[PDB]
Amino acid sequence: LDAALYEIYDGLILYQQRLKSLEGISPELGPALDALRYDMADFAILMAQAMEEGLDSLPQSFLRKALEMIRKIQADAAALREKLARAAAAQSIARKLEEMLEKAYQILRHLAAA
């Protein structure tokens, strides 16, 4: 589970940076991309805190904060996907992003039900 979170953390950073290449496709998508990148950056910081402290030692309040954050990001990622539907490449990144965010959710879902 811990090793799985390290790999998902790597995904968060990768796809957050990959979203920066979608800039310039449309002015309507700009603010959606930026907000998503900044929220993902905050979530990565939170997952960094979780790993360094220890997943077995995480309090319920922390897990609730993390679950709240990832679900909001997942909703916003879905909205980005819907708006996108260069364009094809953006959809591929958005698709892989969604999958990675779901993996992050499943880690936290498992920790919360432990």
Residue numbers in the entry: 4 to 88, 96 to 124
List sentences quoted exactly from the publication behind this structure.
G-CSFR is activated through ligand-induced dimerization of the ectodomains of 2 receptor subunits, which leads to the cross-phosphorylation and activation of the intracellular receptor-associated kinases. Here, we describe an approach for antagonizing cytokine receptor signaling based on designed cytokine mimics with idealized structural and biophysical properties.
By modifying designed G-CSFR binders, we engineered hyper-stable proteins that function as nanomolar signaling antagonists. Furthermore, the most potent design blocks G-CSFR in acute myeloid leukemia cells and primary human hematopoietic stem cells. Thus, the resulting designs can be used for inhibiting or homing to G-CSFR-expressing cells.
